[PDB]
Amino acid sequence: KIVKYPDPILRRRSEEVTNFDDNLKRVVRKMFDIMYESKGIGLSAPQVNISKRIIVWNRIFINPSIVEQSLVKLKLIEGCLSFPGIEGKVERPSIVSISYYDINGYKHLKILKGIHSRIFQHEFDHLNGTLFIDKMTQVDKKKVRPKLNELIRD
Ligand SMILES: CCCC[C@@H](CNNC[C@H](CCCC)C(=O)N[C@@H](CCCCN)C(=O)Nc1ccccc1)C(=O)N[C@@H](CCCCN)C(=O)Nc1ccccc1
Numbered sequence: 309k310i311v312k313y314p315d316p317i318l319r320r321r322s323e324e325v326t327n328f329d330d331n332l333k334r335v336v337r338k339m340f341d342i343m344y345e346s347k348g349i350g351l352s353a354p355q356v357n358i359s360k361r362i363i364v365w366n367r368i369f370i371n372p373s374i375v376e377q378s379l380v381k382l383k384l385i386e387g388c389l390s391f392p393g394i395e396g397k398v399e400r401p402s403i404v405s406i407s408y409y410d411i412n413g414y415k416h417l418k419i420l421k422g423i424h425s426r427i428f429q430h431e432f433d434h435l436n437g438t439l440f441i442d443k444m445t446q447v448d449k450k451k452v453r454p455k456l457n458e459l460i461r462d
Pocket residue numbers: 383384385386387422423426427
C-alpha cells in the first residue's frame with residue numbers, strides 16, 4: 309500500500325541513507341514491487357512509509373540533489389500516487405543537473421531531460437516534504453481544491 313495525502317509522513321524531510329547494505333537492498337526491492345503493483349512510473353520512499361532519501365522508477369537514486377537547471381521551463385500535467393484522482397499542471401525546468409548515489413554507495417553526476425527530468429523532480433520533491441499541489445498553477449489548484457478537501461476529509 310502507498311501512503312496518501314494528507315498523511316504527515318509526506319511532509320517530513322526524508323533522511324540521508326548512511327548504510328548501503330542488505331536492509332537498503334530489501335527496502336529498494338519492496339519499493340519496486342509496490343511500484344509495479346500500483347502501475348506507477350516512479351516511487352519515493354516516503355510514499356511507502358519510509359522516511360529515507362530513496363527514489364526509484366521505470367533505476368535507483370539514493371541521497372539525490374538537484375543542483376542546476378535549464379532556463380527553459382514548462383508546465384506538464386502531473387498525477388501522484390499519493391493523490392488519487394488529482395491532476396494539474398506543474399511548471400518545472402525542462403532539464404536538470406543532478407547527483408545521487410547508487411545501491412553500492414558510489415556517487416554519480418547526471419543531466420536529465422524530457423520525461424526522466426520530470427519524474428525525477430516530482431519524486432525528489434517528495435524527499436523534501438514537497439508535494440505537487442504546492443507548485444501547481446493557481447488555476448489548476450482551484451479546479452482541484454474540492455477534491456483535495458475530500459481527500460482531507462477521508
Ligand atoms: C490536456 C493538455 C495536455 C498538455 C500537455 C502539455 N505539454 N505536453 C508535452 C508532452 C511532452 C512530454 C514531456 C517530457 C506531451 O506531448 N505529452 C503527451 C503525452 C506523452 C506520453 C508519454 N508517455 C500528451 O499529453 N498527449 C496528449 C494526447 C491527447 C490529448 C491530450 C494530450 C501535458 O501536460 N501532458 C501531460 C499528460 C496529460 C495526460 C492526459 N490526461 C504529460 O505529458 N505529463 C507528463 C509527462 C512526463 C512525465 C510526467 C507527466
